[PDB]
Design a binder for this molecule. Sequence first.
Ligand SMILES: *OC1(*)(*)[C@@](*)([O])[C@](*)(O(*)(*)(*)P(*)(=O)(O(*)*)O(*)[C](*)[C@@](*)([C]O(*)[C@@](*)(=O*)[C@@](*)(*)[C](*)[C](*)[C][C][C](*)[C](*)[C](*)[C](*)[C](*)[C])O[C@@](*)(=O)[C]C(*)(*)(*)[C]C(*)(*)(*)[C@@](*)(*)[C][C](*)[C](*)[C][C@@](*)(*)[C](*)*)C(*)(*)(*)(O*)[C@](*)([O])C1(*)(*)OP(*)([O])([O])=O
Ligand SMILES: O=C(O)c1ccc(-c2nc(C(=O)c3c(Cl)cccc3C3CC3)n3cccnc23)cc1O
Ligand SMILES: O=C(O)c1ccc(-c2nc(C(=O)c3c(Cl)cccc3C3CC3)n3cccnc23)cc1O
Lengths: 309, 297, 309, 297
Amino acid sequence: LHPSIPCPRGHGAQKAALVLLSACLVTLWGLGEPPEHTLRYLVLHLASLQLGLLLNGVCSLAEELRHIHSRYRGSYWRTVRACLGCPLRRGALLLLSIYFYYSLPNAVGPPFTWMLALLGLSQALNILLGLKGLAPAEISAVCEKGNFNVAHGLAWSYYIGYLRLILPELQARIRTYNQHYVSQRLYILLPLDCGVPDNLSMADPNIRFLDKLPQRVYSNSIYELLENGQRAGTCVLEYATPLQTLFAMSQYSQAGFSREDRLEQAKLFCRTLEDILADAPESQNNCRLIAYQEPFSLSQEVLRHLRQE
Amino acid sequence: LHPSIPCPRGHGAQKAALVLLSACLVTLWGLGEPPEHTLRYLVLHLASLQLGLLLNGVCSLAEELRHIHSRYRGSYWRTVRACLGCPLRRGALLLLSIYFYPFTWMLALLGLSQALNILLGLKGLAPAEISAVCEKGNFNVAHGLAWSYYIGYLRLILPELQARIRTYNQVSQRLYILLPLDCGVPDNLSMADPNIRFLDKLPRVYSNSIYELLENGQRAGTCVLEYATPLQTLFAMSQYSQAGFSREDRLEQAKLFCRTLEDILADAPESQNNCRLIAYQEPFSLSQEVLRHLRQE
Amino acid sequence: LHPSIPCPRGHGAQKAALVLLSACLVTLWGLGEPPEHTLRYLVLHLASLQLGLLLNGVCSLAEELRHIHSRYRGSYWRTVRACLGCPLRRGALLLLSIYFYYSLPNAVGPPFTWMLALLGLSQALNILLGLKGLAPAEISAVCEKGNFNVAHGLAWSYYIGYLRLILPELQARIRTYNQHYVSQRLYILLPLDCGVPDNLSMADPNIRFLDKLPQRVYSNSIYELLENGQRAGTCVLEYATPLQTLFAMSQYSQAGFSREDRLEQAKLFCRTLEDILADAPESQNNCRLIAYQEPFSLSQEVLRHLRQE
Amino acid sequence: LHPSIPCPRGHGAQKAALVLLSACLVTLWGLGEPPEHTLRYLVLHLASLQLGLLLNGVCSLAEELRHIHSRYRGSYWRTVRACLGCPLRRGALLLLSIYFYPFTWMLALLGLSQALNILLGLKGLAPAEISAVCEKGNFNVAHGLAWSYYIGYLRLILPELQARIRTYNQVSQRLYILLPLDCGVPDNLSMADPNIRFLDKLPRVYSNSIYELLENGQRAGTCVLEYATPLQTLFAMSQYSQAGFSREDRLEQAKLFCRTLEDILADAPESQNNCRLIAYQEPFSLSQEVLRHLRQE
Ligand SMILES: *OC1(*)(*)[C@@](*)([O])[C@](*)(O(*)(*)(*)P(*)(=O)(O(*)*)O(*)[C](*)[C@@](*)([C]O(*)[C@@](*)(=O*)[C@@](*)(*)[C](*)[C](*)[C][C][C](*)[C](*)[C](*)[C](*)[C](*)[C])O[C@@](*)(=O)[C]C(*)(*)(*)[C]C(*)(*)(*)[C@@](*)(*)[C][C](*)[C](*)[C][C@@](*)(*)[C](*)*)C(*)(*)(*)(O*)[C@](*)([O])C1(*)(*)OP(*)([O])([O])=O
Ligand SMILES: O=C(O)c1ccc(-c2nc(C(=O)c3c(Cl)cccc3C3CC3)n3cccnc23)cc1O
Ligand SMILES: O=C(O)c1ccc(-c2nc(C(=O)c3c(Cl)cccc3C3CC3)n3cccnc23)cc1O
């Protein structure tokens, strides 16, 4: 393609680690220290590192528990899974550590508690002082692991392509429509299931096409909402086009894009678009975002936002 | 918006770390070990951790030095900066360690343990931390832009492209997407080079253009040449002042999106000998660069 | 559904393991032995178990290397991956063990070599005497892990549904066709890519429809093969219908059925069908199986099997 | 057939084990440790491994006792047999261990290690061993049969079923698949029960039947009732003598395929309030069993 295009990161770090392991093993052999001390240091280092990761995961879970409904379907198992790996394993070594602590001969106890408290203090400093800060090489590695982090791209493409050019003149469009023939402000429907029908009527019988809007093609339709048959106001309704890409992404079947990733990114896209639109020059009192999940009547969902005006 | 929608991650981890700090300091006060030993061992532990991170970065330098020209503009300083997380904080911690000071035995032991951390993958990020990085901002746009292009314009153009090409000769058989890493694409391709001029079109409504390529005023080839639409988004973002999208960030996402689009098309069913990508960067004649791919047939 | 229908196996074994861990930890605490001996035994046991798994994986790789092209694309990395887990990790601990062995003070060496040889002998006995035999509960767990082991089902369904009822009267069909208007024996095309076109002609321009066959619907077509324009014999050609299911399985996009699993099971189905047909009463000299991979002209592939007759 | 097609796995592992045996015995002869100590420690190691496998099976008994009625016909003997791999070989090894004989300390230690083997998943099968089991024979047919039914008949019937139902009333709105675990399905449903009789059909060619259900000679409901096609395959296999497919194996795959088909339809897009599965087993009136699901609406 181009020599300036980065190739995907390989395993040079693993090769460097192999070389470093060989060099350190050779040096340790040369120094002539007993292998027992090497094994002891490795066991201690691994145990200390995993206890530090346990403390870091507990600290994160103290914050990740706040998104229990939003992120982990309200079940604690996945929240603990996503914060400190396998909870069954972690519990197994937790009980092993409790046994070790309660089985010391009391001539080693307070020293061991002192060491444990020092490790906890070091981990707390690491979290508070930010010494566990990812280098941007590692950040880039995470953000390039797979081609699924589409939420930011979809949100920004949507904004620039459509909303940056629709909203500025939309108010004038609605004004001329009202003068010639209410319907205030654009409404973007955000189904987290990302099910976008061709037209809105089959999605909800209380939403029926009324008319188009004057003035590329920029085909925006005016929809009227019926509450118990009575038309309880009308509004310009519109599905989020980029949510069609996520739906088609999962049906692609060669991307490996699952339904769970479909919902995770629709949720991320839902938040990102609001953040972009919060400070956008041409979105103040000019559009509304309606996010809903199928378990519910769409008409009432849209109607609730018209009352606030 | 909707309760299921996650809110951005807060500072609860910092509060938990503060609680842990309070508990640990209360404990240390309870035991009665003298403060100086506690402080000395704390600085020793922090110094060991920082030198271990230095070794981890040096190991990562092996991988990051292979992208010296592609990713870091042929500058070693940039590569080392990208390998070490916080140069200032690590510098301060190493300065404290130096102030507070066999010996080669523990250097090898600490290196051996760090080597096994990389090899056995013990520093792998948890899903909570993987996703936290992925939503740090709103500038990881390359993946979404590439999938939007494929699932949108490209998937519904490639399989019918060979057909419309087949009715024109009675012109290359591939769709040629130009990808300038500067993301500067004009309305048409005449301003790009004087050697490319509009010829005709190809029968929702899809508007594809034929552009004949010539050398020294003489025809030398013709193909369906079209800019990549989602580069408008990358360029328009940079001009959008309130985003904070810089040229370096724009140029980074332009490259990743270029590579991402290639992997999508590598395994795609509709891109078999149908699509060709031309990634180019002005230090240059566009016509010659495209013509190189035309002669590749 | 039905109380006689087994539910998917849960994690009762994990709960029993937790209870056993708790009981053994309590007993160890009661006995009052030093925790150091417990930690030493655990480290020794884990190291011994992983060395035993390394030896078992090496023994398997001594046989898995024989299927390098067929199974692992001719690359050793995946073969070593599929036999003994991560080879980088295994190499890391292999070098660590070499360092430990070469760093003993020569007053422990021969004892350690004796222990290592005993472990190797025990592993060799385990493999040879079959003491590492999976209980049928575990076999059922593996065979029920996911709904992808479709090869045996597809092969048997194909046999019973189609071939058991087509082959017995096919020879009579070809005989009456020849008498009324060569073409001997059924030919089943087996594309490992499982790309089944609606008709054969677009797959290969040298295969063109000639006629159907007399005598449910049982629509079998007679195809003529052209070599350099000259018709080099004709034969009853037919795609393997169950390979359409695998192709549609991967395009389903909600099953998680990847292209690699598509090829793995098509390969397994290819072998299973031959095994069924080897001893089938009505398949002796009555059908041929043609397996091919897209990198190749289909006509020559089919023609090669007509020469042998 | 084709070189890429894997051949069935041979006995190369046994040859490698023989080579390892030769090397290890040559080593033991070289060192000069007396034979009796070697043999005694070998039997001790084998006894420890066998008792560890016994503990692993006892732990697996917790999971296998929950399927006592479903999987093992309500017999404890069957469950214990299914948890322990080779009762005879383990019995012989434990007999040798008993012949060759603190003490409770090592029992807890050996149990603790076995507990962590299960909890940390250190006995997980490698991909080579996972696939070796999956191709031990050719009787793991439940997965393929279920996917063939869905991707074939079912996927192209369910979405147009509600339509053809909607044109008939001017009848239940679901397709009812009967799944007798004996795999015995007649040509039509009249022989099944006298309370089910053919009524009419529903407009490649698909032949769906309407079957009215009645009680005491009185109409009580009507629905599209049809047997599961791939149960013919399971039953026909058993009658096929050269396969070796027994009733117990047929009944095992019938159940797994029944459950497998439910998971496919649980996440399917075309089975939303469209398909209902009726798994039944004669120790019984079929009409009453189906009618229970009819009233569930
Ligand atoms: O097994 C393995 C495991 O482990 C893993 O996981 P992770 O997350 O990575 O974890 C980690 C561990 C460690 O590391 C490793 O791995 C190895 C090394 C060694 C170490 C030593 C000891 C330590 C201390 C403790 C005491 C007991 O972590 C930890 O630490 C724990 C341990 C346990 C586990 C393992 C065992 C071994 C031992 C040896 C001795 C020397 C993953 O999972 C991987 O994969 C593996 O698995 P598999 O399946 O592959 O086999
Ligand atoms: O593998 C894992 O995930 C894992 C998770 C958690 C732990 C873990 N270790 C301890 C120890 O006190 C301990 C042990 Cl027992 C042996 C050697 C050295 C040490 C101490 C230096 C830190 N400890 C105390 C409370 C809570 N947790 C743990 C170890 C793991 O290996
Ligand atoms: O984790 C893994 O995959 C893994 C893989 C391989 C090994 C591994 N251990 C040894 C040892 O001699 C050893 C060590 Cl060094 C410390 C304590 C006890 C022992 C011996 C009782 C067996 N050994 C010798 C040759 C080849 N391999 C290994 C250990 C792992 O943990």
